[PDB]
Amino acid sequence: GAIIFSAKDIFEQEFGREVRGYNKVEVDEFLDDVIKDYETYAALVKSLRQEIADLKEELT
Amino acid sequence: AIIFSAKDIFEQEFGREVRGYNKVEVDEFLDDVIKDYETYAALVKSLRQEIADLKEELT
Amino acid sequence: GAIIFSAKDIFEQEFGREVRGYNKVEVDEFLDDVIKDYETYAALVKSLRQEIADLKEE
Amino acid sequence: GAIIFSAKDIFEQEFGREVRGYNKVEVDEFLDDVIKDYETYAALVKSLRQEIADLKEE
């Protein structure tokens, strides 16, 4: 299926306030790393598609 | 350079503070993040297979 | 990256030839319409994602 | 209505014969992936429009 979130969306996500909700620093630092993972995967899919496209064109 | 698996997203726990984030909103957000990790993993898997097959065919 | 091609890739796509081939004008002009569908789909996803964002603000 | 073709239209498209025309395997297999993109876009749009109905209901 398609990807729900961009790395932009991950970063822009705001959460409402809740008394005794999750520690904001823990969630924020966690999503900081999740952002890096979205960027890596998005770039990895692009390079793989580019490799396929080059190989198909080679095959031609 | 991948830091997390979907397993790690699911297993991630957080402390609480008085001015915290709404826990349902976070958990419901991370449930979709898990879906995205697994979609990416499966998409990468299938692409690396298409690449291996094309390389076989180029020989 | 669940979408394989951009509209640019459709535009750039080249084919070799064979003896019992497909008519080049027919394929070409068909892909010129596929190109429009890719552009339309990309702009519709972009407009819908904007409606979703705005809705989160309200 | 602004989409010209359905994924099923892409599949059903026939091209006439041209001697030394385009390689059928290359065109067919290209269009197989175009099909997957029409299916993906159509699923995606539906899914975005559902989320919109969801946020309005909420």
Residue numbers in the entry:
A (entry chain B): -1 to 0, 4 to 61
B (entry chain A): 0, 4 to 61
C (entry chain C), D (entry chain D): -1 to 0, 4 to 59
What's the publication's text?
S. pneumoniae, more distantly related to either Bacillus or Listeria, is an ovoid-shaped Gram-positive coccus in which GpsB is essential. In S. pneumoniae, GpsB localises to mid-cell, the only region of active PG synthesis for both peripheral (side-wall) elongation and cell division in this bacterium. SpGpsB co-immunoprecipitated with SpPBP2a (one of three pneumococcal class A PBPs), SpMreC and other proteins, suggesting they interact at some point in the pneumococcal cell cycle. The importance of the SpGpsB residues involved in the interactions with SpPBP2a is also consistent with the phenotype because of the severe growth and morphological defects of S. pneumoniae strains harbouring the SpGpsBTyr23Ala, SpGpsBVal28Ala, SpGpsBAsp29Ala, SpGpsBLeu32Ala and SpGpsBAsp33Ala alleles even though the mutated proteins were still capable of self-interactions and were expressed at wild-type levels. SpGpsBTyr23Ala and SpGpsBAsp29Ala mutations had a greater impact on SpMreC interactions than SpGpsBAsp33Ala; this pattern mirrors the impact of the equivalent mutations (LmGpsBTyr27Ala, LmGpsBAsp33Ala and LmGpsBAsp37Ala) on MreC interactions in L. monocytogenes and thus substantiates the evidence that different surfaces are used by GpsB to bind a specific class A PBP and MreC. Whilst the interactions of SpGpsB with SpEzrA and SpStkP were confirmed by BACTH, and observed with the reciprocal hybrid pairs, they were unaffected by any of the SpGpsB alleles mentioned above.
GpsB has emerged as a major regulator of PG biosynthesis in low G+C Gram-positive bacteria, and its homologues (DivIVA/Wag31/antigen 84) in Actinobacteria play essential roles in hyphal growth and branching. To gain molecular understanding of GpsB function, we report three crystal structures of PBP cytoplasmic mini-domains in complex with GpsB, the first structures of a PG synthase in complex with a cytoplasmic cell cycle regulator. The PG synthase arginine finger pokes into a negatively charged cavity situated between α-helices 1 and 2 of GpsB and is fixed in the same orientation in all structures, just as the phosphoryl group defines the binding orientation of peptides to 14-3-345. Therefore, the role of GpsB in the bacterial cell cycle is that of an adaptor, docking PG synthases to other cell wall enzymes, scaffolds and shape determinants into protein complexes for division (the divisome) and peripheral growth (the elongasome).
